[PDB]
Structures are given as structure tokens and as C-alpha cells.
Amino acid sequence: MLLERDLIQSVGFRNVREGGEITGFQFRVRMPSYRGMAASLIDGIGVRIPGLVDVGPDVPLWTLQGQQYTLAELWDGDGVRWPLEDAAIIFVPLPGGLPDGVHELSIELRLRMSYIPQEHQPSTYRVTKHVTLAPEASGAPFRYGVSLYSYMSDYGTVMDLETAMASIADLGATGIEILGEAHVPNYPNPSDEWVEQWFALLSTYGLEPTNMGSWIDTRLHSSGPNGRDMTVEEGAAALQRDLRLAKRLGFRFVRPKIGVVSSDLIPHPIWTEVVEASLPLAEELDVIICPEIHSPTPIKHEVVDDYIALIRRTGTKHFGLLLDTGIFQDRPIPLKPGELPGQRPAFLDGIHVDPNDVFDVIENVVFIQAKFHDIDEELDDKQIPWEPVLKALKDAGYTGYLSSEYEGEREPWRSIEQVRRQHSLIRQIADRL
Amino acid sequence: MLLERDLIQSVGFRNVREGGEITGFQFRVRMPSYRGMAASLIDGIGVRIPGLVDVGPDVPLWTLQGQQYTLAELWDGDGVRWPLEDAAIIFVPLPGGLPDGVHELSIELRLRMSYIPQEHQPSTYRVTKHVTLAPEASGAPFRYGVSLYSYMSDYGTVMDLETAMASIADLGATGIEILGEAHVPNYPNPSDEWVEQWFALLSTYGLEPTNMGSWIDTRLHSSGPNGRDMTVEEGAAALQRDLRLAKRLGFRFVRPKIGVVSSDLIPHPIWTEVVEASLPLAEELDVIICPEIHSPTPIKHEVVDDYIALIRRTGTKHFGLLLDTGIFQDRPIPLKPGELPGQRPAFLDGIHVDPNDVFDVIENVVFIQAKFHDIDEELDDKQIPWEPVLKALKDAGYTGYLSSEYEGEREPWRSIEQVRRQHSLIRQIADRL
Ligand SMILES: [Mn+2]
Ligand SMILES: [Mn+2]
């Protein structure tokens, strides 16, 4: 598993329970040095959160290689190491723990390097990070998941599958959503080694697969001298291939993204006979087909009414709706540096769907992608009004998943902290209701 | 293997030879989208290097999943994909290839997304990167290696062992140097699975292990009420444990870093009987012990003369010297933001050893760590005068390794491009001589 560049890691910042009592909190620290060293060279860590915690360097306890020690036990110990590949787990005693939210955590880590003269010793590392506590809030009635699209540029550059899965299980989320054409290696035929390893990681971290994203590329052969349009048989075979891979990996929903033929995102005309050809296969494998309702398409739209008309005409239980919460955005996404207003499309200011419009279509919504762009250190969302949205979902009777979809700036490791802030914000709102 | 955040990757930017003729150059591109797609959705890549290359979007060739195609073959193809985990290899036809150095490479990649309206299509990605060509210069008589210390904060956060080894083999380097207490997992007892995997990767990328860095922490039990000093038997067992692990992994040199007892970096007094106790084990395993000569210690020093006196007294062939080229630094390392002059030590301005002082000790130098901090796009080093240094090494008869040690700013992925610039600079100087 990979770590972050910040010494204080976001994953693992939790409260610690011993016998039903919260006895303190913990967090994980990356080794700042270029090597891992023996644990007796540790000279302590001082932990400070302003207003809540201020402990000295000898107060916290160290979990190194699966065993917890005090600092005096580390000084007399032998054989215990802080490896470079491992993050040290620092337990700070605080009866009752920390409250939910983002905390300004400041550490003062001391290490003894023997090759440095004694006057410049110990080596001191002072970092400050705004870290989000793993949510103590039990956000019933919703279930909580994370889409791997939230780590868009992070996956494959700073993150692999196990590091992403470890971060999802640390939030307390139980679902994981992938894009199948991005996160399944050797698509569409993963090896039997990978599929058995994929099922091992789901039982390790306690995650269940929920949604697999799919595409039906209608402009697959549009370019060239022999440029043509995708037919129904080539289009139905694309969706049927994705339903079999989602059944093979344990997923429950498939979201097909059909190509468009106009500026209003009107779907390609083959979609209604591609989907109806694959509804026999979906009912056999028990996977629900759910196309996405995302901005600039509001709920009161002709495209959305075509999805509801397809369910009543066919009478199927394996077609549903996926709701993207970017349609509820009321404040504009900020301007990228280098552009003036006018050349970006006008739906990036938010289309402002009133959240009471979910009452019309909630009996066909099977899955919700919690789309967001920016949450600051006060747990204030900058684009989505989460409190009237979650109030309308709760009163309409939604009890399914809310998968995080981070859409913000793809700064490296920024998406890890942002998804933590969203689960902390949503679970705190759902307890306030 | 992991990739970099930049679309243009530094690793793989080479010249391409077909039948002994350089027919063009290649480079690798990360997929900018959030998914991998079928290769017929590619609408071309336009490649421009100012003054040398300017080709259209349909001119380069694409190597996807182990097979090379033209753009017209991609448009009619079926089943070929650009996976998200793979970087596409772009062959640009240019008879004769590019010269050595850093090139301002500008691409204009076009991809067709079917879910986007036709007026905003194709999706265009324009990035510019200063990338270093893999060196065409054959820098004889030296051999070339990379130390994994060059990727100090990158290893474990953005990089693993195979990604680091793939980048070393792309330079044309043949040696790899590790720090054993940092890069061997479960130190000092790696699993038999890891050791067999470590030997598989060395034969895959054609690397031989050269140097393993070691520490003898004399302040291991200095803190606490029972604080004591490290004895000879505890110190000799530390060095003997590291010689056995370096013999197990195939390394030829061990560099022990002993702790100091004064401001002049005078070594701990146990060092001369720790080393002489381990010289029987070194001659049996055929590993050379080589302590490091690094700044602020010059070559004309009392510490260095003690190493030469130990070789003549014992008469051993398994003790040698390691030369760190930070002692030849003549221009100052720039000030970190936030400090004024005076609180940093005065050897960070460079101690300015004249490079003709290697003629005194070259018969005991077995290994050289090519230390550097900054090389810009004109292949100009900012701290080390590489041309008189390499001229003195060549005339003294050195024919061993020059392992890269990057010491600069630990910006993420910065160390990959910096080590490429150093091998390009050194091999070009060694051909100018
Ligand atoms: Mn979405
Ligand atoms: Mn060095």
C-alpha cells in the first residue's frame, strides 16, 4: 500500500474504543526520514489540536509491527522497528475522544540520528495538517459508498486498488463503485488471478460492490474513409458484455453511458432497442440497468420521462434510475485560471433543480452518486446545498447508497481528504435530521 | 507499474533503431481521460519540438497492447484498446532521430468522446513538458547506475520497486544501489517470495546490484533511565547482519554509516574494531566494505587517512573508499524559503575540494555516488562542476560506477526527470573528453 506525501496521513485518523468506551484517538504518521529505523531511536511525538489536545512528547503510545508500546518501553526494547513501508499508529489518550469534523493537527516528531552531532539533535519534524476524523456519526437511513472515479488522476499515479479500498473502509463506508473500463485490468477479460484477488480484498475491508460504469460508444467507427454508425447488434453486444463482467465481479448495478446526437444531450436513437435487447440478460443475472441523470439534464426532462416510460412499457424490475447530485448545484463552480466568463458552458454555474422534484421519481431511483467539488475546513460545501437535498431524500423514503463522486481539482492526494470531508458532512446532517 | 501526473512521461523518451538505423523517436503518453477506451476513438496526436519536429495528427504510429498501428489502421480496427493502466507508445518518424538533451515536447492529443456534443469534439489535450532523451552518448570508461535514495520521498508514495527499476533501465544504466534498511521490506529478514521476485526483476531490466547502504546506530539505547552506549559486540553484529543480507541479494559493496561523537563528524571509537571484526566475514562472502567520504569531510582529512591506514595495516582487499561528489561542490545550495543566512551550516555553500585530490586516493576508491541538486533545461548543473571532476576521474584511471544521488527538492516526480538529466549530462561530457 502506498502513502501520502504529508507526514500526517488522512486514513486512520479515528477514535479508539476499548470495551465500549472511547479512550482516545489515533492517527498514522509516515516516516519522514529516508530510512526506517529501530524504534528505540524514536525520541517521542508531541501532539497538539488547539482547544482540545496538548500532550507532551512522552504521552502517546506507538503501534509498531502489530504491537503497542509506550515510549519508555520503546527505549528499552530490542528488535522492534518502524519500517519505511509502514505508517506508525500514534494513540493519544483522551477519554471521550474528539468530536466530528476537520481538526488542525500539529505534531512535533523527534528522531535520533546517530551520524548527526549532538548539538543539532534530536531531529525535529513539525507539520500541520487539516485532517478529517473518521465519522462517529451513524448516518441512518442511508448507506454510504465511494466511487473510484473520485480518485480520477490519483488512481494509477499515486494509488492502486488496495490503497483505494483501505481508504474507503476507513470512512466506514460499505460500498464501492468502479468504472469497469477503467479499473478492471485487461478489460474486458481480467485474469482469474485478479478476480480471486478482487474478491479477497472485498472480504478483507468489508466492502460490497455496488455499481459498475459502462459506455456504449456510438462514435466508435465514425472517423476515416469507412466511417459508419454503430448499429443495434454492435450496441447490444457492448451492454451485454458489461452485464456479464459486472455479474462476474459481484456488482448489482450497471450504468451505461450512451452517446449523444445533439446539443441537448439527446441519446442516440439505438438506445431504446439496445436496452430492451439486454433486459432478458439483466433479469437472468440479476443486475439492474440504471442510466445516469446528470447535469445539464434536470429531472423534469423529456429524456428522464423516456426512462420512466420504458419501465412501465416493459414491466421490468431490472431497469432503474441513477441520480447525480450535480443537478442540485446552486452556486457556480469557480473559474479555471486563464479563462474569462463566456467560453465555458452555462451549466457549470449549476442548473439549480429544486430538491423536492425527487418525490416524483423516487420509486425508480436505485442509486445516487453524491457529486461534489469543494468542501473546506469548516465542513461547508461550496456548490451543493446538502441539507435540503438530504432532507428531501429522507422524507421521500430513500434508503439506498450515496456514493461519493469527487469532481474538484485533481491536485495530487487532494481527493483523499475531500471524500473524507463529504462523508463527515453528510453523516452529521443525517443525524441532525 | 505507476505513472506520472504529466501526460508526457519521462521514461521511454528514446530514439528508435530498426536494423541499425535510427528511424525515429518514441515517447509514452498517459491516458488523460478517466477511462481507457477502444483505440478507434483516438483521433490522432500532433507532435511538435521547436526547430526539429512538427508533424500532424495522423503522422505518428501507436503501439497499443504490444502491437504497432497507424492511425488509419486504428480507425478500422477492432478489439485494440488503450488501457488506463498502460501508457501509449507514440512513434514519430524522423530519420536520424533527436540529439541528446532536454527537448520542449508539445503534444496535441485528440480523443473522441461519444457522450459530448459534436460541436465541442474532439476532446483536445495540449501539454508541454521538458523531457530528457534517453542518452545516445556512450559514456565510456565509466559504468552508470542509479541509487534508490534519489527517489527519497517518491519511493513509497508515488513509486514502487518495479517502477523505479524500469526508470533505471530506460537510462541505459546497469547498476542499482539501495539502502537496505529502507528498500528491503521486513528488514532484515525479507521473505523468500520477495527475494525471488527481486532476482526476477534484475534479470528483466538487466540491472546488477552494486551497493547496499548500512547504518551502525551508536545512539541506539542512549535515551532513558537505562541509557547506555553501544558496545563492539552489538556494533559488530550490526555490520555482520548487513553483510549477510547484501550477500543474499547479490550486492558487491556495503556502506556502513557509523555514528559520530563530535562536531567534526569524528566517528565513534568502536568503529575500528567493529570493522576489523567483520573483515573475516567480508572476505568469505566477497563483499567490500566501503565507508562514505562526504561533505563536510574533504579528502585531505584525518578521518580519511584512518581508512587508508586500516587497509595497509590489515592488508585486506575487502575494504575500500566510497566517494561522494558533494565534496566538489563550488556554488551554494540555494536558501530554503523562510530562512535568512546564518542558521544553516556553512558546508551547504560547498567545501570546494579541488578535483585533482582524487589522484592521491584513487587506488582505494571502489564506488562513487554522483551527488547533485539541480540541473536545468540547458543541462547546466547549478552546484557541481562536472567537467573538471569527470576529467580528473578519467585521467586517474577510474572505470567503476557513478551512481546518481539526487539531493534536491523533494517535489513529487521531480527526481525522475533530474536523474535523467544527470546521466544525459555526464555521458555527454565523457564523450567530449
Ligand atoms: Mn456522475
Ligand atoms: Mn551519499
Coordinates of N, CA and C in Angstrom, one line a residue, chain A residues 217-412:
Chain A
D217 N -20.1 3.4 -26.9 CA -19.5 4.5 -27.7 C -20.1 4.4 -29.1
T218 N -21.1 5.3 -29.4 CA -21.7 5.3 -30.7 C -20.9 5.8 -31.8
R219 N -19.8 6.6 -31.5 CA -18.9 7.1 -32.4 C -17.6 6.3 -32.5
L220 N -17.8 4.9 -32.3 CA -16.6 4.0 -32.3 C -15.9 4.0 -33.6
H221 N -16.7 3.9 -34.7 CA -16.1 3.9 -36.0 C -16.6 5.1 -36.9
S222 N -16.6 6.3 -36.3 CA -17.1 7.4 -37.0 C -16.0 8.1 -37.9
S223 N -14.7 7.9 -37.6 CA -13.7 8.5 -38.4 C -13.2 7.7 -39.5
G224 N -12.7 8.3 -40.5 CA -12.0 7.6 -41.6 C -12.8 7.6 -42.9
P225 N -12.2 6.9 -43.9 CA -13.0 6.8 -45.2 C -14.1 5.8 -45.0
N226 N -14.0 4.8 -44.2 CA -15.0 3.8 -44.0 C -15.8 4.1 -42.7
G227 N -16.0 5.4 -42.4 CA -16.7 5.8 -41.2 C -18.1 5.4 -41.2
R228 N -18.6 4.8 -40.2 CA -20.0 4.4 -40.1 C -20.6 4.6 -38.8
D229 N -21.9 4.3 -38.6 CA -22.5 4.4 -37.3 C -22.7 3.1 -36.7
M230 N -22.7 3.1 -35.3 CA -22.9 1.9 -34.6 C -24.3 1.4 -34.7
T231 N -24.5 0.1 -34.9 CA -25.8 -0.5 -35.1 C -26.3 -1.1 -33.8
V232 N -27.5 -1.6 -33.8 CA -28.1 -2.2 -32.6 C -27.3 -3.4 -32.1
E233 N -26.9 -4.3 -33.0 CA -26.3 -5.5 -32.7 C -24.9 -5.3 -32.1
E234 N -24.2 -4.3 -32.6 CA -22.9 -3.9 -32.0 C -23.1 -3.1 -30.8
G235 N -24.3 -2.5 -30.6 CA -24.5 -1.7 -29.4 C -25.1 -2.6 -28.3
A236 N -25.9 -3.6 -28.6 CA -26.4 -4.5 -27.6 C -25.3 -5.4 -27.1
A237 N -24.4 -5.8 -28.0 CA -23.3 -6.6 -27.5 C -22.3 -5.9 -26.6
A238 N -22.3 -4.6 -26.7 CA -21.5 -3.8 -25.7 C -22.1 -3.8 -24.3
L239 N -23.4 -3.6 -24.2 CA -24.0 -3.7 -23.0 C -24.1 -5.1 -22.4
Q240 N -24.3 -6.1 -23.2 CA -24.4 -7.4 -22.7 C -23.0 -7.9 -22.2
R241 N -21.9 -7.4 -22.8 CA -20.6 -7.8 -22.3 C -20.3 -7.1 -21.0
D242 N -20.9 -6.0 -20.7 CA -20.7 -5.3 -19.5 C -21.5 -5.9 -18.3
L243 N -22.7 -6.4 -18.7 CA -23.5 -7.0 -17.6 C -22.9 -8.3 -17.2
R244 N -22.2 -9.0 -18.0 CA -21.6 -10.3 -17.7 C -20.3 -10.1 -16.8
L245 N -19.6 -9.0 -17.0 CA -18.5 -8.7 -16.2 C -18.9 -8.1 -14.9
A246 N -20.0 -7.4 -14.8 CA -20.5 -6.9 -13.5 C -21.1 -8.1 -12.7
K247 N -21.7 -9.1 -13.4 CA -22.1 -10.3 -12.6 C -20.9 -11.1 -12.1
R248 N -19.9 -11.1 -12.9 CA -18.7 -11.9 -12.5 C -18.0 -11.3 -11.3
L249 N -18.1 -10.0 -11.2 CA -17.4 -9.3 -10.1 C -18.2 -9.0 -8.9
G250 N -19.5 -9.3 -9.0 CA -20.4 -9.2 -7.8 C -21.2 -7.9 -7.8
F251 N -21.2 -7.1 -8.8 CA -21.9 -5.8 -8.8 C -23.4 -6.0 -8.9
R252 N -24.1 -5.0 -8.5 CA -25.6 -5.0 -8.5 C -26.2 -4.1 -9.6
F253 N -25.5 -3.0 -9.9 CA -26.0 -2.0 -10.9 C -25.0 -1.8 -12.0
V254 N -25.5 -1.6 -13.2 CA -24.7 -1.2 -14.4 C -25.2 0.1 -14.9
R255 N -24.3 1.1 -15.0 CA -24.7 2.4 -15.6 C -24.2 2.5 -17.0
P256 N -25.0 2.4 -18.0 CA -24.5 2.6 -19.4 C -24.6 4.0 -19.8
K257 N -23.5 4.5 -20.4 CA -23.4 5.9 -20.8 C -23.5 5.9 -22.4
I258 N -24.7 6.2 -22.9 CA -24.9 6.2 -24.4 C -24.4 7.5 -25.0
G259 N -24.0 7.4 -26.2 CA -23.6 8.6 -26.9 C -24.7 9.4 -27.4
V260 N -24.5 10.7 -27.6 CA -25.5 11.7 -27.9 C -25.4 12.1 -29.4
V261 N -26.5 12.7 -29.9 CA -26.6 13.1 -31.2 C -27.0 14.6 -31.4
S262 N -27.1 15.3 -30.3 CA -27.5 16.7 -30.3 C -26.8 17.5 -29.2
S263 N -27.1 18.8 -29.2 CA -26.5 19.7 -28.1 C -27.3 19.5 -26.8
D264 N -28.5 19.0 -26.9 CA -29.3 18.9 -25.6 C -29.1 17.6 -24.9
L265 N -28.0 16.9 -25.3 CA -27.7 15.5 -24.8 C -28.8 14.5 -25.1
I266 N -29.5 14.7 -26.2 CA -30.4 13.7 -26.6 C -29.7 12.4 -27.0
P267 N -30.1 11.2 -26.4 CA -29.4 10.0 -26.6 C -29.5 9.5 -28.1
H268 N -28.6 8.7 -28.5 CA -28.6 8.1 -29.8 C -29.8 7.2 -30.0
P269 N -30.4 7.2 -31.1 CA -31.7 6.5 -31.3 C -31.7 5.0 -31.1
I270 N -30.5 4.4 -31.1 CA -30.4 2.9 -30.9 C -30.6 2.5 -29.5
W271 N -30.7 3.5 -28.5 CA -30.6 3.1 -27.1 C -31.8 2.4 -26.6
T272 N -32.9 2.6 -27.2 CA -34.1 2.0 -26.6 C -34.3 0.6 -27.1
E273 N -33.6 0.2 -28.2 CA -33.6 -1.2 -28.6 C -32.3 -1.9 -28.2
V274 N -31.3 -1.2 -27.8 CA -30.1 -1.8 -27.2 C -30.5 -2.3 -25.8
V275 N -31.2 -1.4 -25.0 CA -31.5 -1.7 -23.6 C -32.6 -2.8 -23.6
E276 N -33.6 -2.8 -24.4 CA -34.6 -3.8 -24.4 C -34.2 -5.1 -24.9
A277 N -33.1 -5.2 -25.6 CA -32.5 -6.4 -26.0 C -31.7 -7.0 -24.9
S278 N -31.2 -6.2 -24.0 CA -30.4 -6.7 -22.9 C -31.1 -6.9 -21.6
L279 N -32.4 -6.5 -21.5 CA -33.2 -6.7 -20.3 C -33.5 -8.2 -20.1
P280 N -33.6 -9.1 -21.1 CA -33.6 -10.6 -20.7 C -32.3 -11.0 -20.0
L281 N -31.1 -10.5 -20.4 CA -29.9 -10.9 -19.8 C -29.8 -10.3 -18.4
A282 N -30.3 -9.1 -18.2 CA -30.2 -8.5 -16.9 C -31.1 -9.2 -15.8
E283 N -32.2 -9.7 -16.2 CA -33.1 -10.4 -15.3 C -32.6 -11.8 -14.9
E284 N -31.8 -12.4 -15.8 CA -31.2 -13.7 -15.6 C -30.0 -13.5 -14.6
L285 N -29.2 -12.6 -14.8 CA -28.0 -12.3 -14.0 C -28.3 -11.5 -12.7
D286 N -29.5 -11.0 -12.6 CA -30.0 -10.1 -11.5 C -29.1 -8.9 -11.3
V287 N -28.9 -8.1 -12.4 CA -28.2 -6.9 -12.4 C -29.2 -5.8 -12.9
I288 N -29.2 -4.7 -12.2 CA -30.1 -3.6 -12.6 C -29.4 -2.7 -13.5
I289 N -30.1 -2.3 -14.6 CA -29.5 -1.3 -15.6 C -30.1 0.0 -15.1
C290 N -29.2 1.0 -14.9 CA -29.5 2.3 -14.4 C -28.8 3.4 -15.1
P291 N -29.4 4.1 -16.1 CA -28.7 5.2 -16.7 C -28.6 6.4 -15.8
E292 N -27.7 7.3 -16.1 CA -27.4 8.4 -15.2 C -28.2 9.6 -15.5
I293 N -28.7 10.3 -14.5 CA -29.4 11.6 -14.6 C -28.5 12.6 -14.1
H294 N -27.8 13.3 -14.9 CA -26.7 14.3 -14.5 C -26.9 15.6 -15.3
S295 N -26.3 16.6 -14.7 CA -26.4 18.0 -15.2 C -25.7 18.1 -16.6
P296 N -26.2 18.8 -17.6 CA -27.3 19.8 -17.6 C -28.7 19.2 -17.7
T297 N -28.9 17.9 -17.6 CA -30.3 17.4 -17.7 C -31.0 17.5 -16.3
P298 N -32.1 18.2 -16.2 CA -32.8 18.2 -14.9 C -33.7 17.0 -14.8
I299 N -34.4 16.9 -13.7 CA -35.4 15.8 -13.5 C -36.6 16.0 -14.4
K300 N -37.1 17.2 -14.5 CA -38.2 17.5 -15.4 C -37.8 17.6 -16.8
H301 N -37.5 16.5 -17.4 CA -36.9 16.5 -18.8 C -37.5 15.4 -19.6
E302 N -37.4 15.5 -20.9 CA -38.0 14.6 -21.8 C -37.2 13.3 -21.9
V303 N -35.9 13.4 -21.6 CA -35.0 12.2 -21.6 C -35.4 11.3 -20.4
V304 N -35.6 12.0 -19.2 CA -35.9 11.3 -18.0 C -37.3 10.6 -18.1
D305 N -38.2 11.2 -18.7 CA -39.6 10.6 -18.9 C -39.5 9.4 -19.8
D306 N -38.5 9.4 -20.7 CA -38.4 8.2 -21.6 C -37.9 7.0 -20.8
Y307 N -37.1 7.2 -19.8 CA -36.7 6.1 -18.9 C -37.9 5.6 -18.1
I308 N -38.7 6.5 -17.6 CA -39.9 6.0 -16.8 C -40.9 5.3 -17.7
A309 N -41.0 5.8 -19.0 CA -41.9 5.1 -19.9 C -41.4 3.8 -20.3
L310 N -40.1 3.5 -20.3 CA -39.6 2.2 -20.7 C -39.9 1.2 -19.6
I311 N -39.9 1.6 -18.3 CA -40.2 0.7 -17.2 C -41.6 0.3 -17.2
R312 N -42.5 1.2 -17.5 CA -44.0 0.8 -17.5 C -44.3 0.0 -18.7
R313 N -43.7 0.3 -19.8 CA -44.0 -0.5 -21.0 C -43.5 -1.9 -20.9
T314 N -42.2 -2.1 -20.4 CA -41.7 -3.4 -20.3 C -42.1 -4.2 -19.0
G315 N -42.4 -3.4 -18.0 CA -42.8 -4.0 -16.7 C -41.6 -4.7 -16.0
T316 N -40.4 -4.2 -16.1 CA -39.2 -4.9 -15.6 C -38.9 -4.3 -14.2
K317 N -38.2 -5.2 -13.5 CA -37.6 -4.8 -12.2 C -36.1 -4.5 -12.2
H318 N -35.6 -4.6 -13.4 CA -34.1 -4.5 -13.6 C -33.7 -3.3 -14.4
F319 N -34.6 -2.3 -14.6 CA -34.3 -1.0 -15.1 C -34.6 0.0 -14.0
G320 N -33.7 0.9 -13.8 CA -33.9 1.9 -12.7 C -33.2 3.2 -13.1
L321 N -33.2 4.2 -12.2 CA -32.6 5.5 -12.4 C -31.4 5.7 -11.5
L322 N -30.4 6.3 -12.0 CA -29.3 6.8 -11.2 C -29.3 8.3 -11.1
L323 N -29.3 8.8 -9.9 CA -29.4 10.2 -9.6 C -28.0 10.8 -9.3
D324 N -27.6 11.8 -10.1 CA -26.3 12.5 -9.8 C -26.7 13.8 -9.2
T325 N -26.1 14.1 -8.0 CA -26.5 15.3 -7.2 C -25.9 16.6 -7.7
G326 N -25.2 16.5 -8.9 CA -24.8 17.8 -9.5 C -25.9 18.6 -10.1
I327 N -27.1 18.0 -10.2 CA -28.2 18.7 -10.7 C -28.8 19.7 -9.6
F328 N -28.5 19.5 -8.4 CA -28.9 20.3 -7.3 C -28.0 21.5 -7.0
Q329 N -26.9 21.6 -7.8 CA -25.9 22.6 -7.5 C -26.5 24.0 -7.7
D330 N -26.3 24.9 -6.7 CA -26.9 26.2 -6.7 C -25.9 27.3 -6.8
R331 N -24.6 27.1 -6.5 CA -23.6 28.1 -6.6 C -22.6 27.7 -7.6
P332 N -21.9 28.6 -8.3 CA -21.1 28.2 -9.5 C -19.8 27.6 -9.1
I333 N -19.4 26.7 -10.0 CA -18.0 26.1 -10.0 C -17.1 27.2 -10.3
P334 N -16.0 27.4 -9.6 CA -15.1 28.6 -9.8 C -14.4 28.5 -11.1
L335 N -14.0 29.7 -11.6 CA -13.4 29.8 -12.9 C -12.0 29.2 -12.9
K336 N -11.6 28.4 -13.9 CA -10.3 27.9 -14.0 C -9.4 29.1 -14.3
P337 N -8.1 29.1 -13.8 CA -7.2 30.1 -14.1 C -6.8 30.2 -15.6
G338 N -7.0 31.3 -16.2 CA -6.8 31.5 -17.6 C -8.0 31.7 -18.5
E339 N -9.2 31.5 -18.0 CA -10.4 31.8 -18.8 C -11.2 33.0 -18.2
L340 N -11.8 33.7 -19.1 CA -12.8 34.7 -18.8 C -14.2 34.2 -19.0
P341 N -15.2 34.8 -18.4 CA -16.6 34.3 -18.5 C -17.1 34.3 -19.9
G342 N -17.6 33.2 -20.3 CA -18.3 33.1 -21.6 C -18.0 31.9 -22.5
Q343 N -16.8 31.4 -22.4 CA -16.4 30.3 -23.3 C -16.7 28.9 -22.6
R344 N -16.9 28.9 -21.3 CA -17.3 27.7 -20.7 C -18.8 27.6 -20.7
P345 N -19.4 26.4 -20.7 CA -20.8 26.2 -20.8 C -21.6 26.7 -19.6
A346 N -22.8 27.1 -19.7 CA -23.5 27.8 -18.7 C -24.1 26.9 -17.6
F347 N -24.0 25.6 -17.8 CA -24.4 24.7 -16.8 C -23.4 24.4 -15.7
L348 N -22.2 25.0 -15.9 CA -21.2 24.9 -14.8 C -21.4 26.0 -13.7
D349 N -22.5 26.8 -13.9 CA -23.0 27.6 -12.8 C -24.0 26.9 -12.0
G350 N -24.4 25.7 -12.3 CA -25.4 24.9 -11.7 C -26.8 25.2 -12.3
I351 N -27.5 24.1 -12.5 CA -28.8 24.2 -13.1 C -29.9 24.4 -12.0
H352 N -29.6 24.2 -10.7 CA -30.5 24.5 -9.6 C -31.8 23.8 -9.6
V353 N -31.8 22.5 -9.7 CA -33.0 21.7 -9.5 C -33.4 21.8 -8.0
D354 N -34.7 22.1 -7.8 CA -35.3 22.1 -6.5 C -35.3 20.7 -6.0
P355 N -34.9 20.4 -4.8 CA -34.8 19.0 -4.3 C -36.1 18.3 -4.0
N356 N -37.2 19.1 -4.1 CA -38.5 18.4 -3.9 C -38.9 17.7 -5.2
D357 N -38.2 17.8 -6.3 CA -38.5 17.1 -7.5 C -38.1 15.7 -7.5
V358 N -37.5 15.2 -6.5 CA -37.1 13.8 -6.4 C -38.4 13.0 -5.9
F359 N -39.4 13.7 -5.4 CA -40.6 13.0 -4.9 C -41.4 12.4 -6.1
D360 N -41.2 12.9 -7.3 CA -41.9 12.4 -8.5 C -41.3 11.0 -8.9
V361 N -40.0 10.9 -8.8 CA -39.3 9.8 -9.4 C -38.5 8.9 -8.4
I362 N -38.9 8.9 -7.1 CA -38.1 8.2 -6.1 C -38.3 6.7 -6.1
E363 N -39.4 6.3 -6.7 CA -39.7 4.8 -6.7 C -38.9 4.1 -7.8
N364 N -38.2 4.9 -8.7 CA -37.3 4.3 -9.7 C -35.9 4.7 -9.5
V365 N -35.5 5.4 -8.5 CA -34.1 5.8 -8.2 C -33.6 4.6 -7.3
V366 N -32.5 4.0 -7.9 CA -31.9 2.8 -7.2 C -30.6 3.2 -6.6
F367 N -30.0 4.3 -7.0 CA -28.6 4.6 -6.7 C -28.4 6.1 -6.9
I368 N -27.5 6.7 -6.0 CA -27.3 8.1 -6.0 C -25.8 8.3 -5.9
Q369 N -25.3 9.0 -6.9 CA -23.9 9.5 -6.9 C -23.8 10.8 -6.3
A370 N -23.2 10.9 -5.1 CA -23.1 12.1 -4.3 C -21.9 12.9 -4.9
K371 N -22.3 13.8 -5.9 CA -21.4 14.6 -6.6 C -21.0 15.9 -5.9
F372 N -19.8 16.2 -5.8 CA -19.4 17.5 -5.1 C -18.0 17.9 -5.6
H373 N -17.7 19.2 -5.3 CA -16.5 19.8 -5.9 C -15.5 20.3 -4.8
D374 N -16.1 20.9 -3.7 CA -15.2 21.6 -2.8 C -15.9 21.6 -1.4
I375 N -15.2 21.1 -0.4 CA -15.6 21.3 1.0 C -14.4 21.8 1.8
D376 N -14.6 22.9 2.5 CA -13.4 23.5 3.2 C -13.3 22.9 4.6
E377 N -12.5 23.5 5.5 CA -12.2 23.0 6.8 C -13.3 23.2 7.8
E378 N -14.3 24.0 7.5 CA -15.5 24.1 8.4 C -16.6 23.2 8.0
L379 N -16.3 22.2 7.1 CA -17.3 21.3 6.5 C -18.5 22.1 5.9
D380 N -18.1 23.1 5.0 CA -19.1 23.8 4.3 C -18.9 23.5 2.8
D381 N -19.9 23.0 2.2 CA -19.8 22.7 0.7 C -20.0 24.0 0.0
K382 N -19.3 24.1 -1.1 CA -19.3 25.4 -1.9 C -20.2 25.3 -3.1
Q383 N -20.7 24.2 -3.4 CA -21.6 24.1 -4.6 C -22.9 23.4 -4.4
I384 N -23.0 22.5 -3.5 CA -24.2 21.7 -3.3 C -24.9 22.0 -2.0
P385 N -26.2 22.4 -1.9 CA -26.8 22.6 -0.7 C -27.3 21.3 0.0
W386 N -26.4 20.7 0.8 CA -26.5 19.3 1.2 C -27.7 19.1 2.2
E387 N -28.0 20.1 2.9 CA -29.0 19.9 4.0 C -30.5 19.8 3.4
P388 N -30.9 20.7 2.5 CA -32.3 20.5 1.9 C -32.3 19.3 1.0
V389 N -31.2 18.9 0.4 CA -31.2 17.7 -0.5 C -31.3 16.4 0.3
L390 N -30.6 16.3 1.4 CA -30.7 15.1 2.2 C -32.0 15.0 3.0
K391 N -32.6 16.2 3.2 CA -33.9 16.2 3.9 C -35.0 15.7 3.0
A392 N -34.9 16.0 1.7 CA -35.9 15.6 0.7 C -35.7 14.1 0.4
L393 N -34.5 13.6 0.4 CA -34.2 12.2 0.1 C -34.8 11.4 1.3
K394 N -34.6 11.8 2.5 CA -35.0 11.1 3.7 C -36.5 11.1 3.8
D395 N -37.2 12.2 3.5 CA -38.7 12.2 3.5 C -39.3 11.5 2.4
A396 N -38.6 11.3 1.2 CA -39.2 10.6 0.1 C -39.0 9.1 0.3
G397 N -38.2 8.7 1.3 CA -38.1 7.3 1.7 C -36.9 6.6 1.1
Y398 N -35.9 7.3 0.7 CA -34.7 6.7 0.1 C -33.8 6.1 1.2
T399 N -33.5 4.9 1.0 CA -32.6 4.2 2.0 C -31.5 3.5 1.3
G400 N -31.1 3.8 0.1 CA -30.0 3.2 -0.6 C -28.7 3.8 -0.4
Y401 N -27.8 3.7 -1.4 CA -26.5 4.2 -1.3 C -26.3 5.6 -1.7
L402 N -25.3 6.3 -1.1 CA -24.8 7.6 -1.5 C -23.3 7.4 -1.8
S403 N -23.0 7.2 -3.1 CA -21.6 7.0 -3.4 C -20.9 8.4 -3.7
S404 N -19.8 8.6 -3.1 CA -19.0 9.9 -3.3 C -18.5 10.0 -4.7
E405 N -18.7 11.1 -5.4 CA -18.1 11.4 -6.7 C -17.4 12.7 -6.5
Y406 N -16.1 12.7 -6.4 CA -15.4 14.0 -6.3 C -15.0 14.5 -7.7
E407 N -15.4 15.8 -7.9 CA -15.3 16.3 -9.3 C -14.4 17.6 -9.2
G408 N -13.7 17.8 -8.1 CA -13.0 19.0 -7.9 C -11.6 19.0 -8.7
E409 N -10.7 19.9 -8.2 CA -9.4 20.0 -8.8 C -8.6 18.7 -8.5
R410 N -8.0 18.2 -9.6 CA -7.2 17.0 -9.5 C -5.7 17.3 -9.0
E411 N -5.6 18.0 -7.9 CA -4.4 18.1 -7.2 C -4.0 16.8 -6.6
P412 N -2.7 16.4 -6.6 CA -2.4 15.1 -6.1 C -2.6 15.0 -4.6

